[PDB]
Amino acid sequence: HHSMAMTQVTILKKGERITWVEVPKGESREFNIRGKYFTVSVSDDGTPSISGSKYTVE
């Protein structure tokens, strides 16, 4: 019975997948994507968000 897995977050550029990251539910992590820093957050309900305007997340 595996413990709790990361939330897998897909990073989208104009709605198309460019990369993916892992973040625990209820937390935020920093990533460098193509030379810029972004905060990716996953809410309690598993919904992700990202700082900046270049990308969205799913």
Side-chain angles (χ1 to χ4, degrees):
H1 191 48
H2 292 296
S3 44
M4 164 46 37
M6 294 280 135
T7 295
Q8 272 204 33
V9 180
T10 297
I11 298 190
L12 304 168
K13 186 170 70 68
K14 294 193 159 358
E16 295 301 326
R17 158 197 20 81
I18 177 188
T19 187
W20 60 277
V21 297
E22 297 179 288
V23 177
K25 283 186 179 176
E27 287 184 36
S28 304
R29 293 299 185 263
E30 202 73 19
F31 297 91
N32 186 309
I33 309 300
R34 308 298 181 96
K36 297 279 168 278
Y37 289 96
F38 298 90
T39 306
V40 175
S41 307
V42 181
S43 301
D44 283 9
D45 66 9
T47 308
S49 55
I50 189 170
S51 62
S53 59
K54 213 186 318 314
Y55 306 119
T56 58
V57 286
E58 231 149 58

